[PDB]
Structure formats: C-alpha cells, structure tokens
Design a protein around this motif. Structure first.
Motif, mmCIF file in Angstrom:
data_model
loop_
_atom_site.group_PDB
_atom_site.id
_atom_site.type_symbol
_atom_site.label_atom_id
_atom_site.label_comp_id
_atom_site.label_asym_id
_atom_site.label_seq_id
_atom_site.Cartn_x
_atom_site.Cartn_y
_atom_site.Cartn_z
ATOM 1 N N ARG A 173 44.607 23.043 39.758
ATOM 2 C CA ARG A 173 45.192 24.373 39.583
ATOM 3 C C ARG A 173 45.383 24.641 38.088
ATOM 4 O O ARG A 173 45.387 23.709 37.274
ATOM 5 C CB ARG A 173 46.545 24.465 40.313
ATOM 6 C CG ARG A 173 46.492 23.933 41.748
ATOM 7 C CD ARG A 173 47.850 23.945 42.419
ATOM 8 N NE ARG A 173 47.749 23.474 43.797
ATOM 9 C CZ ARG A 173 48.798 23.126 44.536
ATOM 10 N NH1 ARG A 173 50.019 23.194 44.021
ATOM 11 N NH2 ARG A 173 48.627 22.694 45.783
ATOM 12 N N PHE A 235 47.993 30.577 37.907
ATOM 13 C CA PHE A 235 49.210 31.346 37.636
ATOM 14 C C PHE A 235 49.155 31.843 36.188
ATOM 15 O O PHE A 235 48.891 31.050 35.273
ATOM 16 C CB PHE A 235 50.430 30.426 37.839
ATOM 17 C CG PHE A 235 51.758 31.151 37.910
ATOM 18 C CD1 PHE A 235 52.286 31.776 36.787
ATOM 19 C CD2 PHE A 235 52.488 31.199 39.100
ATOM 20 C CE1 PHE A 235 53.512 32.461 36.842
ATOM 21 C CE2 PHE A 235 53.719 31.881 39.161
ATOM 22 C CZ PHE A 235 54.224 32.515 38.034
ATOM 23 N N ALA A 278 49.808 35.491 41.532
ATOM 24 C CA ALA A 278 50.755 34.541 40.936
ATOM 25 C C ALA A 278 50.834 34.849 39.441
ATOM 26 O O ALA A 278 49.933 34.480 38.677
ATOM 27 C CB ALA A 278 50.319 33.100 41.208
ATOM 28 N N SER A 279 51.900 35.538 39.020
ATOM 29 C CA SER A 279 52.010 35.975 37.631
ATOM 30 C C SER A 279 53.465 36.250 37.251
ATOM 31 O O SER A 279 54.305 36.551 38.108
ATOM 32 C CB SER A 279 51.112 37.184 37.355
ATOM 33 O OG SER A 279 51.328 38.241 38.274
ATOM 34 N N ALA A 308 59.692 30.798 39.975
ATOM 35 C CA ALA A 308 58.418 31.375 40.408
ATOM 36 C C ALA A 308 57.340 30.308 40.569
ATOM 37 O O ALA A 308 56.539 30.363 41.515
ATOM 38 C CB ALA A 308 57.963 32.449 39.419
ATOM 39 N N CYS A 311 57.979 28.504 43.762
ATOM 40 C CA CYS A 311 57.536 29.324 44.891
ATOM 41 C C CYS A 311 56.014 29.289 45.030
ATOM 42 O O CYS A 311 55.484 29.272 46.150
ATOM 43 C CB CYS A 311 58.040 30.761 44.724
ATOM 44 S SG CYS A 311 59.859 30.936 44.612
ATOM 45 N N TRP A 312 55.301 29.263 43.899
ATOM 46 C CA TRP A 312 53.846 29.104 43.914
ATOM 47 C C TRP A 312 53.440 27.784 44.582
ATOM 48 O O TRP A 312 52.560 27.765 45.457
ATOM 49 C CB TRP A 312 53.332 29.215 42.476
ATOM 50 C CG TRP A 312 51.823 29.166 42.256
ATOM 51 C CD1 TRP A 312 50.845 29.865 42.922
ATOM 52 C CD2 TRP A 312 51.155 28.380 41.265
ATOM 53 N NE1 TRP A 312 49.603 29.552 42.391
ATOM 54 C CE2 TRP A 312 49.772 28.645 41.376
ATOM 55 C CE3 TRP A 312 51.598 27.488 40.281
ATOM 56 C CZ2 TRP A 312 48.828 28.044 40.532
ATOM 57 C CZ3 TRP A 312 50.658 26.889 39.447
ATOM 58 C CH2 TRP A 312 49.289 27.171 39.577
ATOM 59 N N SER A 315 53.740 28.231 48.238
ATOM 60 C CA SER A 315 52.700 29.108 48.774
ATOM 61 C C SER A 315 51.370 28.386 48.968
ATOM 62 O O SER A 315 50.563 28.814 49.804
ATOM 63 C CB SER A 315 52.505 30.325 47.861
ATOM 64 O OG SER A 315 51.738 29.999 46.703
ATOM 65 N N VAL A 324 56.329 35.218 43.901
ATOM 66 C CA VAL A 324 55.358 34.657 42.964
ATOM 67 C C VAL A 324 54.685 35.703 42.079
ATOM 68 O O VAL A 324 54.041 35.321 41.089
ATOM 69 C CB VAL A 324 54.300 33.764 43.662
ATOM 70 C CG1 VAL A 324 54.951 32.826 44.682
ATOM 71 C CG2 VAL A 324 53.260 34.586 44.344
ATOM 72 N N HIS A 325 54.788 36.999 42.396
ATOM 73 C CA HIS A 325 54.213 38.086 41.592
ATOM 74 C C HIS A 325 55.360 38.863 40.947
ATOM 75 O O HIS A 325 56.061 39.630 41.622
ATOM 76 C CB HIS A 325 53.353 39.020 42.451
ATOM 77 C CG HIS A 325 52.754 40.162 41.682
ATOM 78 N ND1 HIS A 325 51.535 40.075 41.040
ATOM 79 C CD2 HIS A 325 53.213 41.416 41.445
ATOM 80 C CE1 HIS A 325 51.276 41.221 40.434
ATOM 81 N NE2 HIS A 325 52.275 42.053 40.666
#
Ligand code: WNA
Ligand code: NAG
Length: 341
Positions: A173, A235, A278-279, A308, A311-312, A315, A324-325
């Motif tokens: 990732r 991300f 994812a940002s 965040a 949370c990613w 997910s 996540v956004h």
C-alpha cells in the motif's frame, strides 16, 4: 533510534557513487513494515546538480551520514506520538538520487552523476526480505514532498517485485504526503521535469506511460494523472494551499487578483481529490510533513490523520464513525482552526 545499513550491493549508489542505504528499527512482535521516502526537490542538469553538491551534499552522497536517526511522527515507536503504527518495523530511506525517486542510470564515462532512485527502492526491499520482511502482512510505502511523488511512481513496482520474487501474501500500500501537485498557471510569470527525466533515464508506472506515450512521461509526475492508473491502495495527504505549490506559482494585504488566484487553487485541488476515497486535505498554508512530532494535532471534520489512517486499515480488512475521505470545503488558508501555527 533507527540504525544505518549501507546497501550490500555497492553498485546501487547515491549521485556521487557512494553506496545508498536505509535506517532500520525492528519490532519482532509486528508483521507491519513502514518504508518512508525522504524528500527534497531534485536537480536536472550538470550545472544545477553541481550547485546542489556544494551546499546540499547529504542529498547527493552517503559519505557524511550519521550512524543513527531518531524516528519521529509516523516513524515514532511511542504510542503518544504515533497512535497509528507505533509498534511497526520502521525504515527511513534517505533521498540521495535527486530524481524524485524515478532514476535508473549509473555513473559512467559519459555521466558525471548516477540517478538510481527507482533501483534504490527495489534494492532496499530485496535486502530487507532477509531481515524479516519475508514474514510481513502489510508493507506501507510512505513518503513526503518529492518522496510523496516517489510513492506514486513506485508503489506498483514494489508490488510487482514481491509477486515475481514469490511473496504473494504481502499486501503493498502507499501513503503519499505533500506530493500531489497541479500543473497550473503561475500567478506571475513542467519543463524542468521534462529535462530531468531525460537526464536521469527516469521511469514512470507502466499503465500511465502507455496512456501518455513517448516524450510525455512528465504527465505521470502529477498525482491527479498518475493516481487513476495505480492498482495498489493509496492514501493521499495534501494541504489545499501547499507552500511548495505556491512557491512554484510565484506566490509570496491581499488584493482581489491574488485572492481569486488563491481561492481558485484550493477549489482545483479539492476537485482533483473528489474521486480519491482515502484522503486527508486540510485548508492550510503549510510546508509541514507527517514525520513531525506534532502530526497528531490537525483535524478535518473532527477527525485526525492517525485516526483516518486507522480507519483506512479497517476498510482494507463504509464504517460508522470511522471516515477515510476528509477534504476541507472552506475556501481560505486557516479557515480550519486546527491548522499548524
Ligand atoms: C514532483 C516534484 C518533487 C519535488 C519537487 C517538485 C516537484 C514538481 N514540481 C512542481 N511542479 N508544479 N508544482 N510543483 C511543486
Ligand atoms: C547490484 O545491482 C545492480 C543494479 O541493480 C545489478 O545490475 C547487479 O546484478 C546487482 N548485484 C547483485 C549481486 O545482485
């Protein structure tokens, strides 16, 4: 502390031919590995690189590197400083190739400097496999500034490398911090990147290369153009009013023309992130990065970046209370009260 290891393959080098390397702190109770790419602009011809060698030599050579470095921010092993990944295996890869991590060219009788950034990443990965990376569940390739663009240029190549070497269970990732730029018009008046790519023998991800075709590979250095072509999860962290973006745009009692320019820049950046699930994009004027000790402090819509990112992770096993956004919608620097001071 993270301890320095110079690459055992001494033909994979910094600009001046000295060996490249990495700093490592192992965590034997963890199957998570964080590999972080340092930033620091680039150089694009002999004269410009000669200047950088005179006064930014650590970005071109390992000869003066220290034996250890302290891990900070997302590289910290303290839970209070790093709520996200404090127990992970930590790797800091120094930026000594001046090529936005894209090069694959050695020194020779025709080349004063070597530009090997893409090969440095692959050799670090190869040597880490014998130090415990072979047992990983997740390899997160992170980076800041030129290193954030380097993540976008290299994450899929790392995934392909591990598959071809026989490690299909490692999930690769990316985390790109402060490396998402716009090829916009300056406030007062891409070519350096185009020249650089030729000087470096620079390489870009294959699907992006096939879209833009010969001579147009510079397009792949811009996040909004390269991101849709990538297969690995990525991300994106980006200030809406990034100081490096404003510097290239020649922006330094604000009158109407500059007010409209700044507001339009934030709107354009927000638009490019609409389809990035994812940002984290706060409405701040900043050059600050994710390895700073107080990276925990900023929030968007009430959620911090360490949250965040957690949370990613969940997910990749939408979530109630775990977003996540996270992109600010307010239109001026520091309209988010949590911006760095
Ligand atoms: C990809 C990269 C890495 C380090 C420094 C600069 C750049 C690209 N330059 C640029 N072009 N338009 N905005 N910016 C910042
Ligand atoms: C060292 O790296 C270079 C460039 O990637 C490669 O050509 C060479 O085969 C490598 N040596 C070994 C022993 O793997």
């Amino acid at each position: 502390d993270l301890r320095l290891h110079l690459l055992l393959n001494t033909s994979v080098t910094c600009n001046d031919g000295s060996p490249a390397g990495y700093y490592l702190k192992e965590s034997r109770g963890s199957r998570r590995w964080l590999l972080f790419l340092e930033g620091g602009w680039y150089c694009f011809n002999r004269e410009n690189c000669d200047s950088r060698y005179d006064t930014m030599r650590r970005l071109m050579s390992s000869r003066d590197w220290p034996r250890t470095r302290t891990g900070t921010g997302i590289l910290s092993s303290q839970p209070e400083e790093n709520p996200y990944w404090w127990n992970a295996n930590m790797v800091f890869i120094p930026y000594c190739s001046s090529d936005v991590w894209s090069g694959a060219s050695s020194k020779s009788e025709k080349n004063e400097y070597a530009f090997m950034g893409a090969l440095i990443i692959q050799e670090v990965v190869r040597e880490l496999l014998g130090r415990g990376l072979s047992g990983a569940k997740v390899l997160l390739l992170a980076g800041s500034s030129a290193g954030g663009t380097g993540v976008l240029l290299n994450v899929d190549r790392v995934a392909e490398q591990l598959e071809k070497l026989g490690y299909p269970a490692i999930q690769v990732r990316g985390l790109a911090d402060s490396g998402w730029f716009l090829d916009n018009k300056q406030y007062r008046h891409t070519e350096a990147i185009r020249r650089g790519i030729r000087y470096w023998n620079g390489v870009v991800p294959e699907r992006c290369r096939r879209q833009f075709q010969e001579g147009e590979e510079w397009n792949c250095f811009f996040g909004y153009k390269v991101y849709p072509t990538l297969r690995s999860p990525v991300f994106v962290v980006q200030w809406l009013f990034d100081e490096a973006q404003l510097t290239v745009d020649n922006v330094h009692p604000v009158q109407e023309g500059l007010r409209l320019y700044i507001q339009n820049l934030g709107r354009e950046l927000r638009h490019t992130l609409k389809d990035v699930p994812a940002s984290f994009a706060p409405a701040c004027l900043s050059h600050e990065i994710i390895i700073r000790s107080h990276w925990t402090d900023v929030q968007v819509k009430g959620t911090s970046l360490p949250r965040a990112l957690h949370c990613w992770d969940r997910s990749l096993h939408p979530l109630k209370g775990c977003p996540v956004h996270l992109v600010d919608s307010c239109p001026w620097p520091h309209c988010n009260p949590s911006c760095p001071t």
